Amino acid sequence: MISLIAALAVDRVIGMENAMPWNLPADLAWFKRNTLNKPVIMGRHTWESIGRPLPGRKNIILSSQPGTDDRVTWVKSVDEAIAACGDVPEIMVIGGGRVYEQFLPKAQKLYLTHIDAEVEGDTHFPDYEPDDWESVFSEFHDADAQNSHSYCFEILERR
Numbered sequence: 667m668i669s670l671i672a673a674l675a676v677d678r679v680i681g682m683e684n685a686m687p688w689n690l691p692a693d694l695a696w697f698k699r700n701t702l703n704k705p706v707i708m709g710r711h712t713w714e715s716i717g718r719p720l721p722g723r724k725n726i727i728l729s730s731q732p733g734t735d736d737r738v739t740w741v742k743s744v745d746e747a748i749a750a751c752g753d754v755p756e757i758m759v760i761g762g763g764r765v766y767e768q769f770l771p772k773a774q775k776l777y778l779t780h781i782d783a784e785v786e787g788d789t790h791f792p793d794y795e796p797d798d799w800e801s802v803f804s805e806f807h808d809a810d811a812q813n814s815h816s817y818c819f820e821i822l823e824r825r
């Protein structure tokens with residue numbers, strides 16, 4: 667099973683200048699809980715944005731060019747990325763925009779954080795078709811001293 671996990675600001679913005687400008691510790695904790703002990707697939711730009719391997723996960727990087735770091739696994743196509751995960755119950759696709767576009771048609775589950783924040787961005791999560799997806803979990807949180815915007819954790823499953 668393939669799942670996508672992402673955090674979306676207003677208008678589906680996910681990034682600006684190869685960064686995420688907000689800081690929501692509760693959302694990063696959600697990301698870690700839902701990805702730990704699973705393979706994670708990311709594109710090369712997202713690898714550069716994170717800047718280091720994510721511990722406790724098999725890190726798989728898509729790039730058309732040879733890898734430059736043997737602490738992670740480098741692959742050259744979507745099918746190779748999936749194969750490199752092996753026989754696991756759930757593969758997590760962690761972006762960025764181009765990678766999400768390619769994996770969305772193959773995904774059964776979306777883990778989405780909706781952040782109440784207006785962000786100038788240059789990268790968006792794909793337009794997906796709402797009729798294709800059932801919301802099976804949602805949890806709203808107001809802003810607090812650690813998290814400066816309100817946010818909604820949602821899990822959707824392909825109908």
Ligand SMILES: NC(=O)c1ccc[n+]([C@@H]2O[C@H](COP(=O)([O-])OP(=O)(O)OC[C@H]3O[C@@H](n4cnc5c(N)ncnc54)[C@H](OP(=O)(O)O)[C@@H]3O)[C@@H](O)[C@H]2O)c1
Nearest residue numbers: 672673681684685709710711712729730761762763764765
């Ligand atoms: N808010 C969130 O949830 C979230 C999550 C992830 C990322 N982000 C943000 O998203 C932005 C990065 O997204 P992006 O769309 O620019 O880039 P990306 O999807 O992370 O990376 C694209 C790169 O991946 C490689 N690639 C993708 N598909 C491939 C394929 N089928 N075969 C081979 N290589 C492939 C290519 O690398 P080569 O050029 O080396 O061939 C391509 O240039 C950043 O702003 C980051 O902060 C946000």
Ligand SMILES: Nc1nc(=O)c2nc(CNc3ccc(C(=O)N[C@@H](CCC(=O)O)C(=O)O)cc3)cnc2[nH]1
Nearest residue numbers: 671672673693694697698712716720721760761779
């Ligand atoms: N829900 C969600 N939120 C995000 O912010 C997010 N970001 C990315 C891409 N960017 C990043 C940037 C940093 C870390 C990261 O350092 N995660 C640590 C959390 C511990 C910490 O630094 O606070 C991790 O171990 O997972 C992960 C993804 C991909 N999917 C996401 N999914």
Ligand SMILES: [Mn+2]
Nearest residue numbers: 743744745746
């Ligand atoms: Mn092929």
Ligand SMILES: [Mn+2]
Nearest residue numbers: 749752753754
């Ligand atoms: Mn197999």
Ligand SMILES: [Mn+2]
Nearest residue numbers: 782783815816
């Ligand atoms: Mn806000």
